[PDB]
Write an enzyme that holds these catalytic residues in place. Structure first.
Site, PDB file in Angstrom:
ATOM      1  N   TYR A  99       3.934   0.563   6.351  1.00  0.00           N
ATOM      2  CA  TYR A  99       3.510   0.632   7.745  1.00  0.00           C
ATOM      3  C   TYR A  99       3.957  -0.595   8.539  1.00  0.00           C
ATOM      4  O   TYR A  99       3.900  -1.724   8.052  1.00  0.00           O
ATOM      5  CB  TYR A  99       1.985   0.776   7.787  1.00  0.00           C
ATOM      6  CG  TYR A  99       1.351   0.511   9.126  1.00  0.00           C
ATOM      7  CD1 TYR A  99       1.622   1.317  10.225  1.00  0.00           C
ATOM      8  CD2 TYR A  99       0.449  -0.530   9.282  1.00  0.00           C
ATOM      9  CE1 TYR A  99       1.025   1.074  11.448  1.00  0.00           C
ATOM     10  CE2 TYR A  99      -0.151  -0.772  10.493  1.00  0.00           C
ATOM     11  CZ  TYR A  99       0.141   0.021  11.567  1.00  0.00           C
ATOM     12  OH  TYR A  99      -0.475  -0.274  12.752  1.00  0.00           O
ATOM     13  N   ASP A 171      -2.705   1.563  -0.321  1.00  0.00           N
ATOM     14  CA  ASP A 171      -3.128   1.953   1.023  1.00  0.00           C
ATOM     15  C   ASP A 171      -3.214   3.475   1.005  1.00  0.00           C
ATOM     16  O   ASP A 171      -2.194   4.171   0.991  1.00  0.00           O
ATOM     17  CB  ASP A 171      -2.146   1.416   2.065  1.00  0.00           C
ATOM     18  CG  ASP A 171      -2.550   1.749   3.506  1.00  0.00           C
ATOM     19  OD1 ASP A 171      -3.257   2.755   3.718  1.00  0.00           O
ATOM     20  OD2 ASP A 171      -2.145   1.008   4.432  1.00  0.00           O
TER      21      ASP A 171
END
Ligand SMILES: O=C(O)c1cc(Cn2ccc3ccc(-c4cc5cccc(Cl)c5s4)cc32)n[nH]1
Ligand SMILES: O=C(O)c1cc(Cn2ccc3ccc(-c4cc5cccc(Cl)c5s4)cc32)n[nH]1
Ligand SMILES: O=C(O)c1cc(Cn2ccc3ccc(-c4cc5cccc(Cl)c5s4)cc32)n[nH]1
Ligand SMILES: O=C(O)c1cc(Cn2ccc3ccc(-c4cc5cccc(Cl)c5s4)cc32)n[nH]1
Ligand SMILES: *Cc1c(COP(=O)(O)O)cnc(C)c1O
Ligand SMILES: *Cc1c(COP(=O)(O)O)cnc(C)c1O
Ligand SMILES: *Cc1c(COP(=O)(O)O)cnc(C)c1O
Ligand SMILES: *Cc1c(COP(=O)(O)O)cnc(C)c1O
Ligand code: NA
Ligand code: NA
Ligand code: NA
Ligand code: NA
Ligand code: NA
Ligand code: NA
Ligand code: NA
Ligand code: NA
Ligand code: NA
Ligand code: NA
Ligand code: NA
Ligand code: NA
Lengths: 380, 380, 380, 380
Positions: A99, A171
């Site tokens: 990300y 994540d």
């Protein structure tokens, strides 16, 4: 018992005192002591612990089959707290397409503190093994990744981390605890941007972390108390409330994802489609072995920038906005909105074409979402 | 115009859209875009900016005579963001008796990232000059300090920082912007634990930062967006609301402080009293030159631990709890509650005796607070 | 388009000003006027109108296919506002087993103001025709009713009311707008205790009213502004948020209701079962003609009081508490909790036996709810 | 002890369970029962009672020296609940210039239910005695009234009500419990629009009622539970919080009121000034005997409509908006904003001239408010 029951009855989300069937909102900073050092219920200062925050922490610990939960003021605050487990000179391995906020925090903030990072293609786990240095202390992976939904083998990553003495972190934002449980596969720490699916209503910015490791939990509690990126009580309450419907929302999203992908694959104005449910997707088998459902994020190629913009304009039920995991279906163009600082030729080389569209499927009626996207694609 | 008017009309705390006379609470994570990249009012994702948070940031910037404000999830999150302006290898000078959370963050977290710190007696500003190293990049001072209320010359500290190319920071929590404005004295960055006086009602944990420096503001905005210790919208709203009465609350607190100190000085069960309003206090003249009022925190010596505990038990209107700056008067014993990990002989050497009591004066009636504390001291 | 899409995109639940994708919470009482009488956006005082309340009112008007919505501080406040459409000397016809709070308000409050009431068996609509007096002005029906789930023909009731010049009102709490839309069948006013399914999370007490009649809307707006039972902005926000998942929650509840009823009908410790989905239930055909789903409230007979209490103790996933429409499955015993003031012989005559149990089915896993209730019944 | 201490420590506004120093916000509708009918802490359904609402009710009962408090969704909901103590055929005496919402509720709603009302000049209490009918059951007075600040003798009104068997009610909004305590003077019921001074921050709409009479309390509790105009928990919390600073805010307002009145009396562009502190004001002596301070509402005459509008435009610190009791000073023109439906000649006869201006003094600096209003008047 089953997942939908655990979402309602897992964790401690009632008031032992009054019996209130929802967690009270402790909009408070400090707590009476009856004698110096005697805390009535273990609370003394809300930065250190707050009962509404404790409630959401118990929920995420239960849902991820962990022992300890932590609530932070954002997903990137959770990530920063986890990175702060390390010292100057330590090294982290991450997936290459992590990300953008994570990439930015690591390469523009934490490298200034002597943390070293390498971004490698973790879709082949031997790439991790090659990247391990004498100074490596942490392996941090998202799966599936954004915006091309690359899948990384969690169990093998956990085994590599255990063998080489690394802290392993997943994540798990895109899959949620409803479909994927990294702690059950041997990962040390799991984290979420609760801003997305967990809150589910586009109205809380928050991060959540869970672990079963008592020592890592003590270290995270110390970091949280010392750097203070804590989630407030109103946002903690709204998270607990939103998580109640996680199972229903994810199941509706998944029904829609399946039908939308069928439509996209059949449509002549769409080229490549990126989603782990597609049988020719790299590591499709790995994903199905480590998850029992799918993310609602899908990416697909239309011809060019003008086609992407026209697609967005022609839809009735797809909303142009940042973030994912809303009750609304959201639509975006990574090349213009998330990767615009990358040179165009490097974007194209990475597969982030001018016509790459990302949708986050919401909970609208499946037929409406399919028909709306199809009729918009018909205008191209 | 005058301070009490500025508290009501300073900053932007109404709704331009509806005319609502209070700031709307934007419990939201993301924002519609009418075209890709066109933000209706500059908002796109609440971690980056949220309109309720923008309101409290405009208030603190106005009250400190700065240009840019930043709201964090706690005072120590504000402090951590400011420390993150520095790189591994950089050095910070701080006052020797800095707040315990600041001490802990610096010596147990940021030293692991290669930040170097020295804690020096800044009551003589030439001690700062001696401590400056080739690697020093920051001077961070509280005044007055806790719990002995030591005073540091802000204007001279700013001049030293300017001459030596240091970022100067003042933790202005104890004085508030109502009485002391470090940016007006040449300091680069001012910060607050808004958990204390600014919120004022013991119901928000928050930090606030203000600066007039555009480049430092850009760096802080980047750190906030990247590490994500942001204040949520409900807490931002409660801060704006609490700040409305800051002037009235501080003025009542000051009337009570003056009378309480008279009583303590006259009382035979009390020895030394620590407060900058006392004319024999070190740097009393400096304090009066840089502030136009006083903190409500007072420390004073009774005989021993048992006397301190009995004092606490005998009061009716002093509440045993952590924190300061409540509407309630609070009472504590640093040796047992904040400095208990320091060895007893080192505590005594530092003046943190077993009988040292700290009070945070609240907004109860002055006569009641004086009479209550006096009658409790009479039982010793 | 379809119902699940309408729940997400129906009504106005974004901010036109910033683009926030959720309704801002206007915690405010009054609004700036740029010139005397010129309202920026039509707001001047929150009792009269508040933008967050306007949002939830637009939602309920849209979902019930009406034109005007009204949000009240509770379901019984909505009912009282509707009763206040009438004058002393006017008469109301209601179903005989109307909700206890409605019965109490009418017979202990509004009869003191000269409102006359008759409670008749509306399962045969000619009973309504017989009960009409020269002074009758209103017909007020719930369907299905509590706790025996009696069904009343809405379309025929609307036709009777139109022919005789009556205001027709349906309390649509148990079915919600997701399954039953009385305004589409000719009813003048529809109302809800939003405390139940609409909010859906046991965390708001609220009432909602919708109508298509401009004149009745003006009268209701005047009553709301004059007697002031308005819903606050935080509760309005939580209602909008909870309504987002209404469709998913009701569909899960309905899957569970069907399987639970099969189990109850087969179980030897259960006698009569009360639910409109059962084909031998009175007016089953009427219900299926006016609704496209079912309430989650089910009542069923076990042997006696001790069996009911033991059933409650033996369940793991059924929570003993008041109210219905939670995400949790709730369980209660009407004879002890709602009808205890009625003499025992009259209770028995009405079918409210000592062993009558009421469940409100929540959104837990269907198999878990069936298995849990079955194993608890096996202990009897 | 003294009033400012009672504001902080009066009532129950902490959490017995955790020790939280502020009242938790119970955003909840229902409560677990451990056995049927056994309530852990007396709570079973939030319409009936909610712990945050109980906290604000304990505060208003304490501040008014009563035994029972009640929190409603608005001031007019409190008034409507009190009027509902009566039956069709009962009669109420009120002061002739009662608040417009009260006038409207009584003459357009409750007269339809057979309640009879007479509005008489209560500044001479023998006017009350003359107006008493065989059917009179209630005497309802505001003092001072709006917008001309007429004063009614509370003690004599209570004596008349006692002698004639009437329920006596005082609307104590303008004075607050900080300055005037009608229950101490023999009045049965005291009520407030907490929307104004008590909340104090223009961000809650709410009503509060207190009484010492157990039987009237039981009747009010039944009405509240049956018609459901209850205050929600977030608004209850914000009320408790705002009341903390009531004493400081009212004292600042009073300092400003005194100086502003001096200025207005001296200014050649101002004619008559209306405020009970003026020694020639009717019943000035009565006011000083029943109150130990003043309301912040002042009315005064300028020449005409154009002068009033110009005055509003020329001020910097007076905000054109409805309501009173904000932290901001507010300004309005009754003839245009509250009494515009009254014919102009009747307005003039009542003293509501075109140039009558009403200010609600806020907590800005006294010198600024005086100077700003004076310079604006200088432009006329
Ligand atoms: O396709 C990827 O490579 C990818 C997408 C995301 C998600 N994402 C969401 C918002 C956003 C903003 C910026 C960027 C990035 C610029 C950049 C440059 C080099 C290496 C990396 Cl990793 C990245 S990321 C990515 C963002 N993360 N990685
Ligand atoms: O009297 C001081 O020296 C002092 C008091 C505070 C305020 N304070 C509030 C809570 C708290 C908790 C722990 C401590 C500390 C232990 C320690 C050891 C060495 C050097 C320092 Cl600086 C400190 S501080 C201080 C705390 N800060 N400094
Ligand atoms: O089975 C019914 O008759 C019935 C159930 C309900 C729902 N309900 C929920 C809470 C509650 C509390 C009390 C009662 C009542 C006592 C009573 C006496 C005469 C006529 C009527 Cl209508 C009623 S109702 C009913 C309650 N409404 N009617
Ligand atoms: O000067 C008064 O007579 C007076 C002022 C207020 C306060 N007030 C605040 C808002 C508002 C709106 C309308 C009116 C009214 C019209 C009217 C007509 C006949 C008798 C009466 Cl009482 C009234 S009141 C009064 C209002 N109450 N009475
Ligand atoms: C079923 C259940 C569990 C157990 O969950 P597993 O996925 O089997 O580990 C935990 N908590 C609650 C409330 C449950 O209902
Ligand atoms: C007076 C005033 C200022 C100016 O403040 P200084 O302390 O003189 O710099 C700013 N804003 C508002 C709203 C004011 O009333
Ligand atoms: C489909 C749709 C409607 C129309 O609803 P009907 O049930 O057909 O009357 C209204 N609003 C929205 C947002 C919709 O999607
Ligand atoms: C002083 C005090 C009281 C007594 O108030 P009176 O005005 O004397 O009746 C009540 N409660 C508290 C908390 C007080 O401090
Ligand atoms: Na639970
Ligand atoms: Na493990
Ligand atoms: Na295709
Ligand atoms: Na302002
Ligand atoms: Na400067
Ligand atoms: Na002394
Ligand atoms: Na919409
Ligand atoms: Na109609
Ligand atoms: Na059976
Ligand atoms: Na108290
Ligand atoms: Na009395
Ligand atoms: Na004059």
């Amino acid at each position: 018992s089953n997942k939908k029951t655990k979402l309602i009855h897992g964790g401690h989300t009632t008031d032992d005192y009054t019996g209130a069937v929802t967690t009270p909102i402790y909009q408070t900073s400090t707590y009476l002591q009856d004698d110096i050092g005697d805390l009535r219920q273990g609370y003394e200062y809300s930065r250190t612990a707050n009962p509404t925050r404790s409630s959401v922490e118990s929920v995420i610990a239960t849902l991820e089959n962990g022992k300890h939960g932590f609530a932070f003021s954002s997903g990137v605050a959770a990530i920063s707290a986890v990175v702060m487990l390390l010292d100057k000179g330590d090294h982290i391995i991450l997936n290459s397409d992590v990300y953008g906020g994570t990439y930015r925090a690591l390469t523009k903030v934490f490298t200034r503190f002597g943390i070293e990072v390498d971004f490698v293609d973790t879709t082949h786990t031997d790439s991790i093994v090659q990247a391990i240095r004498p100074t490596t202390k942490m392996l941090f992976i998202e799966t599936p990744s954004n915006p091309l939904l690359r899948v990384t083998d969690i169990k093998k990553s956990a085994e590599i981390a255990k063998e080489h003495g690394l802290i392993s972190v997943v994540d798990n934002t895109f899959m949620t605890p409803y479909y994927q449980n990294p702690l059950d596969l041997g990962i040390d720490i799991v984290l979420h941007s609760a801003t997305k699916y967990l809150g589910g209503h586009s109205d809380v910015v928050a991060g959540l972390v869970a672990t079963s490791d008592d020592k890592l939990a003590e270290r995270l509690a110390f970091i949280s108390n010392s750097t203070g990126g804590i989630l407030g009580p109103q946002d903690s309450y709204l998270l607990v409330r939103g998580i109640k419907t996680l199972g229903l929302r994810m199941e509706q999203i998944n029904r829609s994802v399946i039908e939308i992908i069928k439509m996209l694959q059949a449509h002549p104005a769409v080229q490549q489609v990126f989603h782990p449910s597609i049988e020719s997707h790299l590591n499709h088998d790995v994903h199905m072995a480590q998850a029992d459902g799918h993310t609602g994020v899908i990416a697909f190629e239309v011809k060019n920038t003008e086609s992407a913009k026209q697609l967005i304009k022609a839809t009735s039920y797809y909303t142009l906005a940042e973030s994912l995991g809303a009750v609304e279906s959201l639509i975006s163009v990574p090349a213009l909105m998330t990767h615009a600082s990358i040179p165009a030729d490097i974007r194209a080389k990475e597969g982030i074409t001018d016509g790459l569209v990302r949708i986050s499927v919401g909970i609208e009626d499946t037929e409406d979402l399919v028909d709306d996207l199809k009729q918009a694609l018909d205008t191209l």
